[PDB]
Design a protein around this ligand. Structure first.
Ligand SMILES: Nc1ncnc2c1ncn2[C@@H]1O[C@H](COP(=O)(O)OP(=O)(O)OP(=O)(O)O)[C@@H](O)[C@H]1O
Ligand SMILES: Nc1ncnc2c1ncn2[C@@H]1O[C@H](COP(=O)(O)OP(=O)(O)OP(=O)(O)O)[C@@H](O)[C@H]1O
Lengths: 330, 624, 281, 143, 167
């Protein structure tokens, strides 16, 4: 059959929300939903909102002139309610001018009809409100930073190898743009259907994974591609990952979530990748990537995900503690 | 008298739209301005974002590219399209000179097209370097929109029965084809990239040889304009001013020009030769057929450029003849005069009669000739360097597999096999440099002779015969030059080897007071050396004289002979000064074709010598 | 700074201290005199063709004299450059021979003994056999440019208004090229010396190399030696092609500018199409 | 002299990370973040893009108004027997000024939009929506 | 600022009606389930749990509502949680926890006890930080009951049956 992914290689969580007892919360956040729409879809709502608004008041202006008797054929004795309204087409054009504030002035609002003064007030309030609504939504759409996460790059498959004696699940994350992600943060989680001694069965248990940072924190400084490794100590859930059971149909997955505010806009972003069981290569290192130039460094992004073969024990980290302890005791 | 787009003449009655708007000869011209202002205003904001960002873009410091399927067929059409749009401009400005009004609709629609066409390839290139084909939709719309509007104009000419006799009908008909072909190029991008509609795009990665940071000779992979103008070299040349050029700057050569890659193709040329044909020996003909297979497909391209550059070279004399002949007529009040509506369509012969038209066409022709000619050199040279690269490897690969018999290695000393790489390979390598000449220099001379007969008559042929008749003597001079050169070359080595002993035991030659005695030997040997160098200096002095005095002698005989023996014309500046350019154009191939032949003679020896060495004794029992 | 050396100081040493003054002057005198005639024969042809197109006379003897003067001057200039080049080459070698012989042995022991050899075989060859030929063609190249530019300026005085903006770009193309061309040519020669020696040493010790089964590595050295030789030559060819394309669009821009002004000046100032042809050819 | 040429810095004394990337296999993500890119640009560049984005919009619809009035036939300098599609459009200069009035909402009213041109009413709708959409996008980038 | 309001996005962050106390890994913990209903993420979510109970210091201090925080028993110590599927947020009752002396006997209604749970985190759409807050009185803490598994793999993907959210 197939093996599902908790999160795909480009985020995009492959979880299906079902049986949602919907209380209309989808539509209550219109302003949030309006931003989530694609740009071509936003224009349709952007366009149909104005176009209906002009056409809603096009009917009002046409009805007012009809009732007042202005559109009666012939140069009548009465003063027109709104000048030069001789068709619904003229009423449509006058509807556009007032709300957009073009105001050509061949179709003025006269001082005769007080009903039109109210409608002129209403159309301006509606015009200012709708325009204010559309400005805000477009500002948050222009301030979107989800496409910035597309430039955050992870290696195709991670590795488990040797480093300072211990065994670490190494990795590589790179930033392609030149702008910085202020206050970066890395959270790694191991997802496995984990049972418990008490008898509980957790269908997808997410256990956090330390990043093996120098100060025991999450902050990273992303300028050149780095290695985000996790030292597999006695408490690491990967303490019993033998190389034998690293095959495809293994309930194993490493979620990596990189967070940080984009320096250009100030919007926080997340970049998420998952390394399945078959996407981990035991006993391989990452090639040296940062070369030196005459007065600067040089990152060979061609060699971003290249891994070489490195000698290593083919035994579990649990057997590394036992092997070291016996050797130290002897 | 303001600026009126249509004809301001006839009380400004050209804006009337009775009998359909499409029948208004000016409105169809207006319809052809919208497809250009559409693109000129859609891409200008898009390009300016890039240009402003390019001021602070570092990824383009060493970025890679991927030319879209049809990159070459796009540029060759664009340059053709740019050329024809200049012709429409020339016709448009030509027609309106007779009317009292400006008639801006004749050329400004074409003038806007020329700006739009230039941006359409700047806009396309910026989408080529950044592998983002999705922006080609704006380009795709332009070709779809420009083609439709132009075709409506073309068919409406036929309704009014414009006919091919009018130049504007020819150029408009041509523009439909160029716009249509450029449209198919954009569609073919979607077929191979599959980026608009298809769910699974077949993305393409930059070539592996380009991904190397250690490859800096990016000639094989650049836009077709930089392949011709060598624009990519600009950064390297500027870098040479600050950072001196060492093997650091000159980085690893591309895959196509690597010695191992060329050696594989030469062996395949040999392996296929011994497979398709079962020939026991590997003779001179075996090698000659081998090289053509392994490097013909580039040698033909060098010849194609040279043939076209040779033909375009004579556009100068024809433009000089055309420009002056129009200026040799006192009557300039006369002008092109034929009408269909009142726009005064101009014809073919009237188009190439205006002096300014020919100067502009000369300018366009000169750019082509001097760019094809230079591109002809590079293709010939790069093939020559690769031939040297694949032959040095083959010779060296023969060194490993040869036996050490006293009958074999006691004959061909290291000096014999050293000169094979230095002398024998270079004269063969230099032959592939000049190979296009012998295919084309006869063509350029014959075409020169054919149309030089028409320009002045017979007296040009009589005078030009002196150039042809004295060329075989020049071959004798060059041959006698080299014979005196080897006498100095052999004598310089003898004296230099004599003084090498002198400078090697100097202490015994100075403590024994033998410096005065030994020096006199060098001087005496020098005198026998200097007589030979004097003979060489004579022949290279005579070589210059025949090189420069013959063209003066050709003109002196031609013009005096024309007046005295022929007297068939007055030798107007139209005819006389057109011939002077032809002599300048013909002298360079006429007086250098001797060297092409001599190199071919030398190259025949080199391949003959190389084939004799390449089938000598081998270290047997290696395969077993 | 060491690479940036136009080297006008080396030309003065050659001419003043080795050539002479009688022979040097006649070399410069003949060059200017030869190309002065070369302008005249073309100019006189324009006047002949323009005026004879029906005071005035038949130009059936004057044009012969200009050609006869030009043809003879070609022989004079050709002989003088080669004869003077011989005199410098022969007497410079005698000076070098009279110095090294009358030199202390301390310099010989200290010197690499190849520095004296190179300045005796490689350098004396270029001075003896190339300068007599390169100097003649160098002067003729720059004098033809001067001859051409002067005639174009005289026919169309509006051309030299744009010549200064165009000449400056010509200078920068003629500036950056020499810096790169010297470096490439030095890289052209120094990269092929290891190649020929590598061939010679393989022939010298062919038995040893096959004995160690080291021919696999030496072939890989050849590909490294050959590829460096080619990539140095490919850049040299590109540099020549970079110059030649750029210095021909400049020439093409001249043709359009010269033709445009000349045609207009043939319609208003009435150049009478005579000097127009000389302005084009 | 390469031994003591320079020591490459990781980040300069004033930020400005002294690291240059190579072989960036861009798939258009450089420009896909248009609204991030527009902000990153220096102010004098932003003024050029601000100017071009509006000059092109005014001039793109200048060719539309000029052509509509051309096709309608009220461009002909004659007696106003018909009812003009957009009044007072006499030359492309008037077509350009009327494009300024509609998009920037100045609306002088010398060049009105008449009811006798169903095609022109559509463009007046299109120009306003494009004019409103350009402004809102440009205001957001400035903020 | 009214458009960028995220007070209606906090309503789609879901907490179960009642929390539970059961055994885990040989210890006693206070489990809870938090769920997110919208497809978007809440970047950098963080969850704090506090016990609000009038606790008097032996010296005589009277604090009518003393809020003492509670560790989340996270695998790394920090409080950050990655919320896509509903998660069991459980606090392990160690020797330091204020819940160290809780029994089913004294879990009745009129009990001076309360567990507050606060879920922070920025919205991935508008960039506005939000908060989801719930409380669990003593009676709303069902002793000795486990939450049912909610995720079951479908033909090619996972599936959370929200119909059994608080079961
Ligand atoms: N030079 C580069 N420029 C931009 N992104 C890169 C570059 N090199 C790698 N990546 C990114 O890194 C990830 C995969 O890196 P890796 O080199 O390990 O795999 P790959 O085989 O090159 O990937 P793919 O076939 O998906 O492009 C992808 O997200 C890819 O876009
Ligand atoms: N499937 C669901 N879809 C949407 N919201 C849900 C869903 N399940 C629970 N919720 C939300 O979580 C709250 C608590 O859920 P729980 O299942 O524990 O209680 P409940 O008895 O189903 O809820 P209630 O009667 O208050 O609606 C609900 O009140 C509701 O707001």
């Amino acid at each position: 059959e197939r093996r599902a992914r908790f999160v795909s290689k480009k985020g995009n969580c492959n979880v299906a929300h079902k049986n949602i007892r919907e209380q209309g919360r989808f539509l209550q956040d219109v302003f949030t939903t309006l931003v989530d729409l694609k740009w071509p879809h936003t224009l349709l709502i952007f366009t149909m909102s104005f176009l209906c608004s002009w056409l809603l008041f096009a009917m009002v202006w046409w009805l007012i002139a009809f009732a007042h008797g202005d559109l009666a054929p012939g140069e009548g004795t009465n003063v027109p309610c709104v000048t030069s309204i001789h068709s619904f087409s003229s009423a449509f054009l006058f509807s556009i001018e007032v709300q957009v504030t073009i105001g050509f002035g061949g179709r003025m609002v006269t001082e005769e009809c007080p009903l039109a003064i109210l409608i002129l007030i209403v159309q301006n309030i509606v015009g200012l409100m709708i325009n204010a609504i559309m400005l805000g939504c477009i500002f948050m759409k222009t301030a979107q930073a989800h496409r910035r996460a597309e430039t955050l790059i992870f290696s195709k498959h991670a590795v488990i190898t040797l480093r300072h004696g211990r065994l670490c699940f190494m990795l590589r994350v790179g930033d392609l743009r030149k702008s910085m992600i202020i206050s970066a943060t890395i959270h790694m989680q191991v997802v496995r259907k984990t049972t418990s001694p008490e008898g509980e069965v957790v269908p997808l248990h997410q256990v956090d994974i330390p990043m093996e940072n120098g100060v025991g924190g999450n902050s990273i400084f992303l300028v050149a591609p780095l290695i985000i490794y996790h030292v597999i100590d006695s408490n690491s859930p990967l303490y019993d990952l033998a190389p034998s059971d690293l095959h495809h149909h293994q309930d194993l997955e490493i979620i990596v979530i990189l967070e940080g505010v984009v320096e250009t806009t100030g919007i926080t972003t997340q970049a998420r990748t998952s390394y399945l069981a078959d996407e981990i290569l035991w006993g391989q290192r990452f090639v040296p990537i940062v070369a030196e130039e005459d007065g600067r460094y040089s990152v060979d992004y061609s060699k971003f995900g290249n891994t070489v073969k490195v000698p290593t024990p083919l035994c579990t980290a649990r057997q590394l503690d036992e092997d070291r302890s016996l050797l130290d005791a002897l | 008298m303001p600026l009126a787009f249509c004809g301001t003449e006839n009380h400004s009655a050209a804006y009337r739209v009775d009998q359909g708007v499409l029948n208004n000869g000016c409105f169809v011209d207006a319809l052809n301005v919208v497809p250009h202002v559409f693109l000129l205003f859609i891409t200008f904001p898009i390009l300016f974002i890039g240009w402003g960002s390019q001021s602070s873009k570092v990824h383009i410091h060493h970025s890679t590219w991927l030319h879209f399927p049809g990159h070459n067929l796009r540029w060759i059409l664009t340059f053709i399209l740019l050329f024809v749009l200049v012709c429409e401009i020339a016709e448009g400005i030509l027609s309106d000179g007779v009317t009292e009004s400006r008639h801006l609709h004749l050329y400004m629609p074409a003038g806007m097209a020329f700006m739009a066409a230039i941006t359409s390839v700047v806009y396309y290139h910026n989408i080529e370097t950044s592998n983002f084909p999705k922006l080609l939709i704006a380009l795709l719309i332009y070709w779809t929109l420009a083609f439709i509007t132009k075709t409506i104009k073309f068919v409406k000419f036929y309704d009014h029965a414009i006919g091919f006799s009018q130049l504007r009908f020819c150029l408009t008909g041509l523009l439909v084809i160029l716009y249509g072909m450029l449209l198919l190029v954009e569609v073919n991008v979607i077929r191979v990239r599959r980026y608009i509609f298809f769910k699974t795009p077949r993305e393409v990665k930059p070539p592996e040889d380009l991904q190397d940071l250690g490859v800096r000779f990016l000639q094989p992979f650049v836009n077709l304009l930089s392949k011709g103008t060598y624009w990519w070299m600009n950064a390297f040349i500027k870098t040479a001013h600050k950072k001196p050029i060492d093997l650091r700057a000159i980085a690893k050569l591309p895959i196509a020009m690597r010695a191992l890659t060329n050696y594989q193709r030469l062996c395949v040329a040999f392996d296929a030769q011994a497979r398709k044909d079962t020939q026991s020996p590997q003779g001179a003909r075996a090698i000659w057929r081998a090289l053509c297979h392994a490097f013909g497909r580039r040698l033909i391209l060098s010849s194609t450029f040279r043939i076209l550059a040779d033909l375009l070279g004579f556009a100068g004399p024809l433009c000089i003849f055309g420009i002056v002949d129009h200026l040799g007529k006192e009557n300039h009040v006369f002008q092109p005069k034929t009408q269909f509506l009142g726009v005064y369509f101009v014809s073919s012969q009237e188009f190439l009669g205006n002096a300014y038209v020919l100067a502009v066409l000369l300018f366009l022709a000169l750019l082509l000739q001097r760019t094809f000619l230079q591109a002809s050199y590079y293709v010939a040279i790069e093939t020559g360097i690769n031939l040297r690269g694949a032959i040095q490897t083959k010779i060296y690969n023969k060194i490993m597999h040869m036996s050490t018999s006293n009958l074999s290695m006691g004959e061909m000393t290291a000096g014999q096999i050293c000169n094979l790489v230095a002398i024998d390979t270079n004269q063969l390598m230099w032959f592939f440099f000049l190979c296009p000449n012998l295919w084309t220099m006869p063509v350029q001379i014959i075409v020169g002779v054919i149309l030089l007969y028409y320009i002045l008559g017979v007296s040009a042929l009589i005078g030009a015969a002196v150039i042809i008749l004295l060329a075989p003597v020049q071959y004798f001079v060059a041959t006698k030059l080299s014979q005196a050169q080897r006498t100095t070359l052999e004598h310089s080595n003898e004296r230099l080897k004599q003084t090498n002993e002198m400078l090697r035991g100097m202490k015994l030659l100075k403590l024994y007071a033998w410096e005065s005695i030994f020096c006199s030997r060098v001087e005496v040997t020098r005198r026998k050396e200097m007589t030979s160098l004097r003979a060489f200096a004579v022949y290279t002095s005579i070589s210059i004289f025949m090189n420069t005095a013959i063209p003066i002698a050709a003109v002196l005989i031609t013009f005096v002979g024309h007046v005295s023996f022929f007297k068939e014309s007055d030798l107007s500046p139209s005819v006389a000064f057109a011939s002077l350019s032809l002599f300048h154009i013909l002298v360079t191939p006429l007086f250098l074709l001797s060297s092409v032949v001599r190199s071919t003679v030398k190259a025949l020896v080199s391949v003959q010598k190389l084939s004799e060495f390449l089938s000598s004794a081998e270290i047997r029992e290696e395969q077993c | 700074l060491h690479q940036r050396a136009k080297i006008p100081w080396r030309a003065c040493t050659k001419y003043l201290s080795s050539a002479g003054i009688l022979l040097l002057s006649l070399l410069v005198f003949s060059q200017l005199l030869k190309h002065m005639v070369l302008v005249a024969i073309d100019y006189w042809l324009a006047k002949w063709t323009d005026s004879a197109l029906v005071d005035q006379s038949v130009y059936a003897m004057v044009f012969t004299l200009l050609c006869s003067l030009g043809i003879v001057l070609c022989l004079v200039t050709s002989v003088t450059v080669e004869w003077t080049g011989l005199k410098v080459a022969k007497r410079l070698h005698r000076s070098l021979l009279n110095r090294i012989i009358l030199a202390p042995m301390r310099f010989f022991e200290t010197t690499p003994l190849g520095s004296i050899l190179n300045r005796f075989s490689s350098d004396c060859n270029t001075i003896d056999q190339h300068i007599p030929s390169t100097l003649e063609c160098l002067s003729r190249s720059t004098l033809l440019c001067v001859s051409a530019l002067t005639v174009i300026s005289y026919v169309t005085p509006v051309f030299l208004v744009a010549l200064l903006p165009l000449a400056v770009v010509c200078y920068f193309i003629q500036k950056y090229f020499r810096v790169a061309s010297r470096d490439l040519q030095q890289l052209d020669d120094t990269t092929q010396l290891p190649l020929v020696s590598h061939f010679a040493e393989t022939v010298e010790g062919l038995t040893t190399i096959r004995a160690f089964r080291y021919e696999a590595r030496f072939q890989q050295k050849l590909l490294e030696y050959t590829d460096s030789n080619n990539i140095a030559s490919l850049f040299l060819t590109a540099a020549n092609r970079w110059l030649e394309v750029c210095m021909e669009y400049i020439g093409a821009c001249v043709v359009l500018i010269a033709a445009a002004t000349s045609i207009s000046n043939s319609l208003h100032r009435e150049l009478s199409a005579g000097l127009v042809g000389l302005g084009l050819t | 002299y390469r031994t003591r040429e320079r020591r490459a810095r990781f980040v300069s004394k004033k930020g400005n990370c002294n690291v240059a990337h190579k072989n960036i296999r861009e798939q258009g993500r450089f420009l896909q973040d248009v609204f991030t890119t527009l902000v990153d640009l220096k102010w004098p560049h932003t003024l050029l893009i601000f100017t071009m984005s509006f000059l092109c919009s005014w001039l793109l619809f200048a060719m539309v108004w000029w052509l509509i009035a051309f096709a309608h036939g009220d461009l002909a300098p004659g007696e106003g027997t018909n009812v003009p599609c957009v009044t007072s459009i006499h030359s492309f200069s008037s077509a350009f000024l009327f494009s300024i009035e509609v998009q920037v909402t100045i609306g002088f009213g010398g060049r009105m939009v008449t009811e006798e041109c169903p095609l022109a009413i559509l463009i007046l709708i299109v120009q306003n929506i494009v004019g409103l959409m350009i402004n809102a996008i440009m205001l957001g980038c400035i903020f």
